[PDB]
Write a protein that binds this ligand. Sequence first.
Ligand code: HEM
Length: 189
Amino acid sequence: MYGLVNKAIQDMISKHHGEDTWEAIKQKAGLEDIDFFVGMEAYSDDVTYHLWGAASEVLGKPAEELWIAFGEYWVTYTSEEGYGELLASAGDSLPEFMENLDNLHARVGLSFPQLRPPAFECQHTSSKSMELHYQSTRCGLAPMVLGLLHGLGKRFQTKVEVTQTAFRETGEDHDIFSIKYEGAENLYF
Ligand code: HEM
């Protein structure tokens, strides 16, 4: 993964648990040679997997729980580190935005020439619901989609219930999320 991701992890951890913890984590994972992470430079995935392995131990939090928090941060992080207009161009509501994910990652591809993006297909069972299909070149990142989907609720001021209905690990083609989403009707009635 690009340093861009590894820095978000760093900033997320430093923001939440302080710098000295982040330094412990960085030490335990085996990556003290790196004085810092470079956004537009590809690194081996291991760096990432390894950080979370260290983080998980040092913070006593399971991996699943870290990725989830990370999915939410990412959304915010990318919009603040200067990809906010990409985000804005991608959609004006939650359903619209899901359709344009492959496209957005293809536009991101021009700045990140070695990207290996996820693939999402959206199927709109109605205006309060969809299935989301998530295909990836990597293992185990479905918790991160949970985090993102929640971060997208907040983005569109929508309440989103997400439940994973297919798990790749049990022998499916890809992970599938069933997502319920309501606006303010939730609140008023
Ligand atoms: C401008 C916004 C975004 C940028 C710049 C961005 C960029 C990236 C980058 C650099 C990676 C690492 C890929 C690699 O190093 O090979 C990545 C991974 C990922 N991105 Fe985004 N992305 C953005 C928005 C989103 C959004 C909104 C979602 C919402 C679902 C999303 C879902 C993911 C997922 C799931 C991965 C995991 C990779 C995998 O499954 O193989 N991204 N993205």
